[PDB]
C-alpha cells in the first residue's frame, strides 16, 4: 500500500507540472506596428529618378 | 538623462530579482487555487 501512496504523490506532482507547464515561449514583446511606412522610401526614389534622368 | 538611466537600471534589477522568483510563483499560485 506504500507504493499506492507513492504513485498518488507522483501523480499529484505530474498534475501540478502539467497544469502549470511554463512553456519554452515567453512573449517578451507583443506585436506593434511602426506608424512610419517602410515602403516606399520617397527620398531614395526621388534621388534615383533625378540621377537616372 | 541620469534619472532615466538610473530608472532603467533599477527596473532591470528589480525585474531580474522578480524573474529569478518566477517559476515557483506560478506553481504556488496554482497550488493556492487548488487547495480544497
Amino acid at each position: 500500500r506504500a507504493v499506492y501512496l507513492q504513485l498518488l504523490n507522483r501523480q499529484q506532482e505530474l498534475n501540478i507540472a502539467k497544469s502549470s507547464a511554463i512553456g519554452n515561449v515567453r512573449i517578451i514583446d507583443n506585436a506593434v506596428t511602426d506608424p512610419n511606412p517602410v515602403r516606399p522610401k520617397k527620398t531614395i526614389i526621388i534621388v534615383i529618378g533625378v540621377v537616372l534622368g | 538623462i541620469s534619472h532615466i538611466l538610473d530608472s532603467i537600471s533599477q527596473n532591470y534589477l528589480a525585474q531580474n530579482i522578480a524573474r529569478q522568483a518566477a517559476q515557483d510563483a506560478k506553481s504556488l499560485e496554482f497550488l493556492n487555487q487548488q487547495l480544497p
Binding site: 517578451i28 514583446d29 506593434v32 | 538623462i1 541620469s2 538611466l5 538610473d6 532603467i8 537600471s9 532591470y12
Partner: peptide, 28 residues
C-alpha cells in the same frame, strides 16, 4: 549654436550577456 548633448553612463554586474543585451532594449 548647436544644442549641447551630454552623455551619462552606468556599469552593471552580471552574475551570457548577449540575451541580457537584447532584453535591455526590449519594449517591456
Amino acid at each position: 549654436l548647436a544644442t549641447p548633448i551630454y552623455e551619462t553612463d552606468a556599469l552593471i554586474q552580471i552574475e551570457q550577456s548577449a540575451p541580457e543585451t537584447a532584453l535591455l532594449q526590449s519594449r517591456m
